[PDB]
Design a protein around this nucleic acid. Structure first.
Ligand SMILES: [Zn+2]
Ligand SMILES: [Zn+2]
Lengths: 136, 456, 86
DNA sequence: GCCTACCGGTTCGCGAACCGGTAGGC
DNA sequence: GCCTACCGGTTCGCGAACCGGTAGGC
């Protein structure tokens, strides 16, 4: 219960650490970037552009912090974070959707285009290499 | 098709067609995982769109007058593609992700028991109820004739699913089929998810459904038609459509005693759930079934054998004779592959009448079936081609009617002995089966009507 | 998939199933998902976060029962969690 | 040959109106 | 499923204003 309650307590530290890291990053882009920027951000990173404002920065924020998601193994579609895992949203067939799901998806590093006169301010928010943490 | 009465304009203006292609389509889309199982009917009467969850009050519709007739084509062919994913004309159709898929719509002078026979085999509402248990859409399947090429595909998808089930294929592969099937044949699961076709027998179940559904539309095909001239009677009109000479064998008859013996004698020791009671005996003579059976009257080893089937099937069994499963259809359920099956015991065959404590009457057949040189089998074995010189297959059971009490009948061997042990017991059959792989080999002799007596 | 749903108003347009006033944009609001009578789909019944807990609903453990809980802001998650118990 | 009060017409500036595509509601 | 408030991108409409041509006055 000493090492149990410590890793238990020290993870809920790192979970909040993550939660409001992305949140800081989200409404940073909302302050600086228009939707079209963010749209063309994802496209550059070979990422499916979702429909929705919130969801667009939610995937740009994820993109920046963890990585540009590589296509799916079988259906070659776009994995998307959803609550507790990365779910594939592609199409294994015209009739049936793909059901791939993982906590450790494949990804290359997120490449911001040269055009960023405040990417030195956003990335100056003490952000190092780290993987997605999940709930217990 | 005709106008959807949800428009409220059905008997007012006609549904329109440009030369050939009829401006009306019925779409459907199912996702077993989401649960979604949904229709979309589009028409050009005005443009009428209907939509909702197949087989429920869930949904709505929009009737809408147009500014003009060429704007109809514009609106229609747009709505169509938006919803289906294709253009209005295409060489072969292609489904698209989350888009719909279109379904391919198309004073009587007789005895009292014979009238009851037509009464019994041409009550289509009885056949409808029959379906309700399969969960086929009850609402618009009577007026909406589902196509032949369609149903053949519905079959194929089944046969695909068995193949997939046998060699433990992907859940995806299976999922896709389950989706494909329910999309193509609208079911009614109310507010709960279409269930996956993962079993061996679930397919068999859906195969049976198609078989039965096919014969109802065949019973309609008979019923709807002829020459409506004020001369003959209604029951006679339907009798003549059966294309068969039916007669009533009298109970006093000496041959009738034999059948009742065949019935009483050859009831199964293990099938004790019910008790038979021959209400009637009919001598049945199909149109030209003797012209095609003449070949096999030369053939030796001819046997008078039982064959039971649903009361709904007998409307078509009379008009087309006994038929073999289509080639598209799955082989699941059959022991030795597609072909007419027969039993020496009235009980075993009686179970294919599918009666209950609320529907007590049932019909069972007796056919001179020219077995000839029999291919004998102990274990289940899906056969394609018969071995050489064999005209039939036999499934060897534990119990066989006494071969030293095999009475004859018009030069036909009637095995109406009671059950004794067989010559070999290394079999996985409890009772005999007789299989012919050619519709000519069978010649229907007697049609019986049986009341069942259960204990509940 | 889940019965309930929580997010920041995607627009201050949708009204609240209990009181019937416009749920303002970017505000914490909660949903209960129902069958639409109009089409073959689930639809959210949007409630003002205040109004949600007077309809008699009691989500025992929000993080496992309510959708969008992980995506919320941290301090807002705790509001739901605590208010779940009272 | 000036000046200038008066007028017809081309320009310009800025908010109102319009509008097709669509995220969000039910 | 369909309906519609919202978003950005453009056009429209109209009044100030800018300008050049001019004809009565000294
Ligand atoms: Zn995939
Ligand atoms: Zn409220």
């Amino acid at each position: 219960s000493k090492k149990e309650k410590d890793k238990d307590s020290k993870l809920e530290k790192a979970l909040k650490a993550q939660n409001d890291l992305i949140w800081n990053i989200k409404d940073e882009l909302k302050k600086v970037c228009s939707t079209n920027d963010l749209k063309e951000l994802l496209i550059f990173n070979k990422q499916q552009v979702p429909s929705g404002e919130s969801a667009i920065l939610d995937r740009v924020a994820d993109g920046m912090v963890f990585g540009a998601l590589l296509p799916c193994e079988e259906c070659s579609g776009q994995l998307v974070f959803k609550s507790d895992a990365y779910y594939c949203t592609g199409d294994v067939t015209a009739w049936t959707k793909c059901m791939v799901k993982t906590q450790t998806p494949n990804r290359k590093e997120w490449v911001t285009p040269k055009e960023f006169r405040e990417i030195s301010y956003l990335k100056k928010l003490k952000v190092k290499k780290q993987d997605r943490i999940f709930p217990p | 098709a005709a106008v959807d009465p949800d428009s409220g304009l059905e008997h007012s203006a006609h549904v329109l067609e440009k030369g050939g292609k009829v401006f009306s389509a019925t779409l459907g889309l199912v996702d077993i995982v989401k649960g979604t199982n949904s229709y979309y009917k589009l028409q050009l009467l005005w443009i009428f769109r209907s939509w909702g969850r197949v087989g429920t009050v869930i949904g709505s519709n929009k009737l809408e007058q147009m500014p003009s007739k060429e704007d109809a084509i514009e609106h229609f062919m747009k709505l169509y593609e938006e919803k289906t994913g294709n253009a209005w004309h295409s060489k072969n159709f292609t489904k698209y992700p989350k888009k719909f898929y279109p379904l391919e719509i198309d004073k009587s002078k007789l005895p009292k028991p014979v009238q009851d026979l037509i009464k019994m085999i041409f009550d289509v509402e009885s056949m409808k109820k029959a379906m309700v248990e399969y969960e086929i859409d009850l609402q618009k399947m009577p007026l909406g004739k589902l196509s032949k090429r369609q149903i053949q595909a519905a079959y194929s998808i089944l046969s695909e699913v068995q193949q997939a089930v046998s060699q433990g294929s992907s859940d995806s592969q299976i999922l896709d089929l389950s989706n494909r099937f329910y999309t193509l044949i609208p079911h009614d699961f109310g507010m709960k998810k279409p269930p996956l076709l993962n079993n061996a027998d679930s397919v068999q179940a859906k195969a049976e459904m198609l078989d039965n559904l096919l014969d109802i539309e065949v019973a309609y095909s008979l019923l709807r038609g002829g020459s409506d001239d004020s001369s003959k009677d209604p029951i006679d009109v339907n009798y003549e459509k059966l294309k068969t000479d039916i007669k009533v064998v009298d109970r006093d008859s000496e041959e009738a005693e034999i059948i009742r013996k065949y019935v009483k004698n050859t009831h199964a020791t293990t099938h004790n759930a019910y008790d038979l009671e021959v209400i009637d005996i009919f001598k049945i003579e199909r149109e030209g079934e003797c012209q095609r059976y003449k070949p096999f009257k030369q053939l030796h080893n001819r046997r008078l054998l039982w064959h039971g089937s649903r009361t709904t099937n007998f409307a078509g069994i009379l008009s087309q004779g006994l038929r073999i499963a289509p080639p598209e259809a799955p082989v699941t359920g059959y022991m030795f592959g597609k072909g007419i099956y027969f039993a020496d015991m009235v009980s075993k065959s009686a179970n294919y009448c599918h009666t209950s404590q609320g529907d007590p009457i049932g019909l069972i057949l007796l056919g001179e079936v020219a077995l000839g040189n029999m291919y004998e089998l102990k274990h289940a074995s899906h056969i394609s081609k018969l071995p050489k010189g064999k005209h039939s297959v036999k499934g060897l059971g534990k119990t066989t009617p006494d071969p030293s009490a095999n009475i004859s009948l018009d030069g036909v061997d009637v095995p109406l002995g009671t059950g004794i042990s067989s010559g070999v017991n290394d079999t996985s059959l409890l009772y005999n089966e007789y299989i012919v792989y050619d519709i000519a080999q069978v010649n229907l002799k007697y049609l019986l009507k049986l009341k069942f007596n259960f204990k509940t | 998939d889940k019965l309930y749903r929580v997010e920041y108003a995607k627009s201050g347009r949708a009204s609240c199933k209990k009181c019937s006033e416009s749920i303002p944009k970017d505000s914490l609001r909660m949903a209960i998902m129902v069958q639409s009578p109009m089409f073959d789909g689930k639809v959210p019944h949007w409630y003002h976060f205040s109004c949600f807990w007077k309809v008699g609903h009691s989500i025992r453990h929000p993080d496992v029962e309510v959708d969008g809980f992980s995506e919320l802001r941290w301090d807002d998650q705790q509001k739901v969690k605590k208010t779940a118990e009272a």
